[PDB]
Amino acid sequence: TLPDTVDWREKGCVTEVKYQGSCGACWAFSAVGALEGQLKLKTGKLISLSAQNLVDCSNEEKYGNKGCGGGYMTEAFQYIIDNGGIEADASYPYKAMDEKCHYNSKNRAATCSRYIQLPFGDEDALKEAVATKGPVSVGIDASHSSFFFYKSGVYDDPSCTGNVNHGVLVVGYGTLDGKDYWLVKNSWGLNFGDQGYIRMARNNKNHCGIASYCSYPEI
Numbered sequence: 001t002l003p004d005t006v007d008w009r010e011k012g013c014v015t016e017v018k019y020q021g022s023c024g025a026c027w028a029f030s031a032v033g034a035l036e037g038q039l040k041l042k043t044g045k046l047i048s049l050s051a052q053n054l055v056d057c058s059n060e061e062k063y064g065n066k067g068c069g070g071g072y073m074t075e076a077f078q079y080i081i082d083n084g085g086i087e088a089d090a091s092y093p094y095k096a097m098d099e100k101c102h103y104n105s106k107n108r109a110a111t112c113s114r115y116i117q118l119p120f121g122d123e124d125a126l127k128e129a130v131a132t133k134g135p136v137s138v139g140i141d142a143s144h145s146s147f148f149f150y151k152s153g154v155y156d157d158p159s160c161t162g163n164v165n166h167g168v169l170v171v172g173y174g175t176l177d178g179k180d181y182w183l184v185k186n187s188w189g190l191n192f193g194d195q196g197y198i199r200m201a202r203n204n205k206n207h208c209g210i211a212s213y214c215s216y217p218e219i
Ligand SMILES: *C(=N)C1(NC(=O)[C@@H]2C[C@@H](S(=O)(=O)c3ccccc3C(F)(F)F)CN2)CC1
Pocket: 023, 024, 025, 026, 027, 069, 070, 071, 072, 073, 074, 138, 139, 140, 164, 165, 166, 167, 213, 214
């Protein structure tokens, strides 16, 4: 049986909330956030990993990422696999602009061997993965102003669609005042939502596309 409530923050598997700025790096923050969870679960250390390393070094057709022009979490993971590593934020900090790649293997702080994609639209599979694997990268439709109006409760705007546009991180789930939710870490700083997080409707027919494109890496 799966736990009724999960919050990876409580297990020290989630780093501080980041601020992407004007750079379209949501995908990179979502990817590093999933890998940070796995790194903590394997090594016992909680380390912020370099979103900028992803932005600078996978901006080419091989990956179909475009740096600050947007990208995909699974292609971030594929880069880390191909590259044999990724740096920590501390040695490769965030600039919110495209830069020339300067990855250095002496500063490797994590690796990725493979990644897993969950079945499209399957919220039961997402629940199982969050409970048993760790934080999971997902895409959502975050294109409605109500997403930024949100401060507390469970986000469930009827104007959401299945047409996703932003990569974020699912770090838990539960039920709040009788409404099932996913606990989502964003990359808009602490001023977004509830200290950087939004609780999004769970079990409402794949609302906002949250279970359409779920993936997580393995160290
Ligand atoms: C983030 N600041 C911005 N969005 C992106 O870079 C997006 C993330 C992904 S997605 O989540 O929207 C996505 C769309 C369609 C199919 C699959 C996905 C997946 F797999 F990533 F979830 C694509 N670009 C605004 C730049």
